[PDB]
């Protein structure tokens, strides 16, 4: 006999396009179970469930792929016929298409001090937020103007979008880094302009240039007398004088004067 209890159907309330779902349908208290036919289907698509049997029951588990042709509210159904009687369970499932938000930069690599604008568009009904702006999502697209600076090189611009589907919030996000080229710099902290060393002492002159791309460095006095940056040298009277340090890269050129003063013993 087939009981008056309908089958239990377990399935997610929503399912994304081009993704695989999992549906399981079960019923206890029916016999003979071998004579029972289980028909599992999502809308028009007849599913193929691998059925586990007991002496008095069945458990039908089935995967279900969905495409753009399934988009919308489909009906997941699980019918069980046992001779003359029949029990079926219905459940709605919404197949939704929700692409990832498109964070779009005017130019991927920009020069320093340039007006860069970062946009993020998404699904019309969805609501987006660009690096937490606006706080609490409102409308499907957001902007952000910025004066490009060296600190913005490698700066990520994340966009979070939320889409309401069948009474629940689905979340997605996208992230894109900005590349910012910035001219050479000889900053004082990594290249001081004044040394004072005792004669015949071991010293290492220090000077690093900043820039994207990495600048090439060269410090010369009296024409072509190189200051050995990074090397540990014996300080002599020959090293005394004012050097002209020059940083070089595709973004420009900078100079800094570095004086070396030798104290006689």
């Amino acid at each position, epitope marked *: 006999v087939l009981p008056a209890t309908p089958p239990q159907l377990v399935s997610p309330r929503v399912l994304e396009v081009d993704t695989q779902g999992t549906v399981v349908c079960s019923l206890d208290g029916l016999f003979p179970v071998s004579e029972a036919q289980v028909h599992l289907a999502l809308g028009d698509q007849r599913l193929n469930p691998t059925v586990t049997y007991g002496n008095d029951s069945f458990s039908a588990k089935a995967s279900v792929s969905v495409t753009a042709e399934d988009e919308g509210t489909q009906r997941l159904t699980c019918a069980v016929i046992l001779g003359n009687q029949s029990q079926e369970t219905l459940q709605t499932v919404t197949i939704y298409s929700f692409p990832a938000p498109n964070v779009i930069l005017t130019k991927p690599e920009v020069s320093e001090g340039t007006e860069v604008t970062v946009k993020c568009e998404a699904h019309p009904r969805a609501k987006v937020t660009l690096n937490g702006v606006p706080a609490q999502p409102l409308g499907p697209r957001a902007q952000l103007l910025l004066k490009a600076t060296p600190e913005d090189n490698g700066r990520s611009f994340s966009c979070s979008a939320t889409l309401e589907v069948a009474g629940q919030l689905i979340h997605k996000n996208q992230t894109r880094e900005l590349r910012v080229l910035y001219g050479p710099r000889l900053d004082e902290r990594d290249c001081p302009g004044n040394w004072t060393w005792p004669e015949n002492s071991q010293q290492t002159p220090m000077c*690093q240039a900043w820039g994207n791309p990495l600048p090439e460095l060269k410090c010369l006095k009296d024409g072509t007398f190189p200051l050995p*940056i990074g090397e540990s040298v014996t300080v002599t009277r020959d090293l005394e004088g004012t050097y002209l340090c020059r940083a070089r890269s595709t973004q420009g050129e900078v100079t800094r004067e570095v004086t070396v003063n030798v104290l006689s013993p």
Partner: antibody
Amino acid sequence: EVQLQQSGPELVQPGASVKISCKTSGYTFSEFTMHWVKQSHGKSLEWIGGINTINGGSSYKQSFKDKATLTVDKSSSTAYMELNSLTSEDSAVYYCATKGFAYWGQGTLVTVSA
Amino acid sequence: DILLTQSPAILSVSPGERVSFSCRASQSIGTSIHWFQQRINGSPRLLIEYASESISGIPSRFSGSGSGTDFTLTINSVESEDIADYYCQQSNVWPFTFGSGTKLEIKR
């Protein structure tokens, strides 16, 4: 985002050594000089030295010459400071810092005790 | 080496007031001075760069001034979360040196 991740708490015998690592990420390692600062528990900062991140050339304060040794592994973008002949006076928090002290590490508490 | 002496050591003040930190240099160092904030159990945090140039991501209430030997950090309107140690640092000639420090306490 810029991150300087230091090696974390150390306990070492007097006379022993310790090698504090500063694993960097989120920027070009060879662009900026790496500096190392010490802070005693009396809360007074002190520049140990700096190391050139291209050629490995280092410069030290007179106090920490022979005491401290700065080195660099460019491939892994990591700076190492080794301290040796450790006394109780060397017990303090040690910081790696970079880009003219714009980015610091979380600090490494070194303890010298028998 | 260039010696930096800060004053006062402790700086007890109510919220909303205009507080000021002093840092005197032993030599004349132009504008090669930088200010740091250190909250307890935390790393130092660069506030002001080269006397008066502002750092990105730092509140507007933090400003700096001075040139040569005397330098000043100023908080326009002090807030409760400004409790910390404050250090000046010179970058004119190596080695880098820091000030003795000033501690900002909050009245309540």
